[PDB]
Amino acid sequence: MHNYVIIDAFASVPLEGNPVAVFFDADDLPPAQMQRIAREMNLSESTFVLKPRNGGDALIRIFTPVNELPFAGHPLLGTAIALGAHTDNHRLYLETQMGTIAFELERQNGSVIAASMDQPIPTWTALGRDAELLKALGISDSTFPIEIYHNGPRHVFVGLPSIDALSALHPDHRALSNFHDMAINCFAGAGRRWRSRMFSPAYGVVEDAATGSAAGPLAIHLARHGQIEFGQPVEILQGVEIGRPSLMFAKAEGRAEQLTRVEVSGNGVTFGRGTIVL
Amino acid sequence: MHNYVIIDAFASVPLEGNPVAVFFDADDLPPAQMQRIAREMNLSESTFVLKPRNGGDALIRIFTPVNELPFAGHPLLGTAIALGAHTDNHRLYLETQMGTIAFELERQNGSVIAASMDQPIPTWTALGRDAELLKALGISDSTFPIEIYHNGPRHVFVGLPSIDALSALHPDHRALSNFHDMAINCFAGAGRRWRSRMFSPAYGVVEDAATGSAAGPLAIHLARHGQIEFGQPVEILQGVEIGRPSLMFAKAEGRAEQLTRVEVSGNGVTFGRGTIVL
Numbered sequence: 060m061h062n063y064v065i066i067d068a069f070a071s072v073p074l075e076g077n078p079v080a081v082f083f084d085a086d087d088l089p090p091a092q093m094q095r096i097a098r099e100m101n102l103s104e105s106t107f108v109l110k111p112r113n114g115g116d117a118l119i120r121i122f123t124p125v126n127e128l129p130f131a132g133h134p135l136l137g138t139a140i141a142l143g144a145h146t147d148n149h150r151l152y153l154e155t156q157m158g159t160i161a162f163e164l165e166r167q168n169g170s171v172i173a174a175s176m177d178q179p180i181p182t183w184t185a186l187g188r189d190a191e192l193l194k195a196l197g198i199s200d201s202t203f204p205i206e207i208y209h210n211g212p213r214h215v216f217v218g219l220p221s222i223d224a225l226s227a228l229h230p231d232h233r234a235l236s237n238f239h240d241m242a243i244n245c246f247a248g249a250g251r252r253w254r255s256r257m258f259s260p261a262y263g264v265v266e267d268a269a270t271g272s273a274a275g276p277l278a279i280h281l282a283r284h285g286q287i288e289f290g291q292p293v294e295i296l297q298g299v300e301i302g303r304p305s306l307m308f309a310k311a312e313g314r315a316e317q318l319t320r321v322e323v324s325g326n327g328v329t330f331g332r333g334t335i336v337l
Numbered sequence: 338m339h340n341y342v343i344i345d346a347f348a349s350v351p352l353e354g355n356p357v358a359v360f361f362d363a364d365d366l367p368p369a370q371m372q373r374i375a376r377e378m379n380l381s382e383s384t385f386v387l388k389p390r391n392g393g394d395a396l397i398r399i400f401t402p403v404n405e406l407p408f409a410g411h412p413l414l415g416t417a418i419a420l421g422a423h424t425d426n427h428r429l430y431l432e433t434q435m436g437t438i439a440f441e442l443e444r445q446n447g448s449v450i451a452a453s454m455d456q457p458i459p460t461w462t463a464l465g466r467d468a469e470l471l472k473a474l475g476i477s478d479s480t481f482p483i484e485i486y487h488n489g490p491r492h493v494f495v496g497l498p499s500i501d502a503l504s505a506l507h508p509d510h511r512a513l514s515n516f517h518d519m520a521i522n523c524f525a526g527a528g529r530r531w532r533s534r535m536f537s538p539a540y541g542v543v544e545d546a547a548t549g550s551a552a553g554p555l556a557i558h559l560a561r562h563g564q565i566e567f568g569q570p571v572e573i574l575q576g577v578e579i580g581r582p583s584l585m586f587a588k589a590e591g592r593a594e595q596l597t598r599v600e601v602s603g604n605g606v607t608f609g610r611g612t613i614v615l
Contacts, residue, residue: 063611065377073614074373095352099343099608101379233511302373330377333341333611336351
């Protein structure tokens, strides 16, 4: 049998944020069985906590209902928060396919309520399909350059001139399906405070509550395009329009040509706990 | 807090069949909150066990992640099996939007391992879009007439000349998306033993493991088209190609013009059990 918890990542209130199922003591499960369990659960992701193999605290394997992922933000944040119930350590080193990711855990009375991660440093370039993407979103132009970032998944960013213009988007999801192996992240805001919406046929989601692997890239995007400085944190509120508000905090240190750290943080809360029969 | 179980319906082995989450003691939950919980879980359906209002044993409300349903086969079968852990009764009367559905529970040593339901009697007519549907499925013709049945959801049936021809189907799901408010059920077999595959963009599933509300209609279809008699049971094995084999048993009594009973039965098994925080 295995115990699991469901964590709503990037939220402090259950039914907000983005759920992940975290399965403990998973070393007896072959990967094909982990994949079947992730399919059974049908959450965006299920993760599995394994013994470490390179000096970290644990090895985490991440599965959607259909495949394994090398890196994912909200699922790793939820896993780190879940593992709080089982360690006293202030820092947690989680091994993944992209290497060991360092987390700082934040507690109140023994309960981990939030965590911060250092993400893989992305790469980026211009999308080069702007008219096609804009048509699919139903708008004429972006504010800032339309650029696509890679840190495992790929995330394209399209800027809107106001929060209301962002909420008014009703994309043609069929048209968006021509954009393979990426998520489309539309954003608006000013200063410290930004709003986002994410759409991805390629990743099997009509609209995502909290895209944790897009938060680091967005901070970089905003700094490069002069809306914040490198080293300044931003608050990104996602998922409001779909009723799953999610608050992500991000900061990118260094400069565009030499990034030294990309930090993403948020709250997490337990929605449920259970046991499975295998 | 609420307790729940995950039942794999139309299976006796966990990770086979079609999952449903069953939430107990749900009378304190407003429907908008039931809908939010069903969305959180993201299973094809979550059900909620409520006090009866018209003389049954319980009232069951059925939700997909996006809406409430009046009737659904695999979710009601799973609910009846789950409720076995909480009653000694041989029969269970479950109130729904389509009225009270009678279940017979089958136990071994106190555990309910299977159940039989009397389904709403469907109606049917020719689809009248045969060339369009056949093109979408990638085939030239059906064996038997292409007819669409209604018992809450709508189910169209297209016959294939062999089980291998059925397994070879690779439908164009975009083309299938032009068929609104229905599921497409392709079938093959002979005598007592049939195979099916179900596809439905309209109902949010690429391919379904076990379509319980299609089993009763299929028995009627096979009887009307002379492949079985009215009153003769069939075994329908679904979901083999997607690795979620599901065994459904169905029988239609009477004659086409005066159906007296449509029975569907199957096994169910618990995959997991848990508690949520609201």
